[PDB]
Structure 1
Amino acid sequence: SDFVVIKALEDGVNVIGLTRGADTRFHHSEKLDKGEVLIAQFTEHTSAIKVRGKAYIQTRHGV
């Protein structure tokens, strides 16, 4: 069970969730204005996170 930490470093940062399955779409996009944090798990329905705009990211790997 893995998760990503996203801290918005500027306004209007986008976290877009891509769909698990044969076909791939943007199922949900979350918005982060400067200084807001989103902690997001890879899930049954979500197998790719896309981060748009300057932001600080923490993963199971490093920084």
Structure 2
Amino acid sequence: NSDFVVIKALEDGVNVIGLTRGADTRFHHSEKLDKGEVLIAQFTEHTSAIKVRGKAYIQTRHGVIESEG
């Protein structure tokens, strides 16, 4: 039942990086998206922070935001 974010890649090679939940913080996975693909990604037991690199249109419960490459 956690929140989720919507990431639409606006160019090739966007990275959606999950950061580890817990006392330690590191990248545990980078999912690479190509232009026009959409990832819908939850917060989870393993992921408590999500970093987006590259150009993407993003939706979350607080509205739209855009990352730039």
Give the TM-score, by structure 1 length. Answer: 0.98
| Deviation string, structure 1 residues 8-35 (Cα, Å, up to 9, x no partner) | 0001000000000001010000000000
Question: Which ranges of structure 1 fall in alignment gaps of 5 or more residues?
Answer: none
Counterpart-to-counterpart distance in 2, 1:52 and 1:39: 16
For these two proteins, the number of residue pairs brought into alignment is 63
Percent of pairs with identical residues: 100
Q: Which runs of 5+ in 2 are unaligned?
A: 65-69
Greater relative contact order, per chain length (Cα 8 Å cut-off, separation 6+): 1
Please report the TM-score for the alignment, with normalisation by the length of structure 2: 0.90
Deviations 1:6-61 (A, max 9, x none): 00000100000000000101000000000001000000110000000000000011
> After TM superposition, where is structure 1 displaced by more than 4 Å over at least 4 residues in a row?
none
CA root-mean-square deviation: 0.4
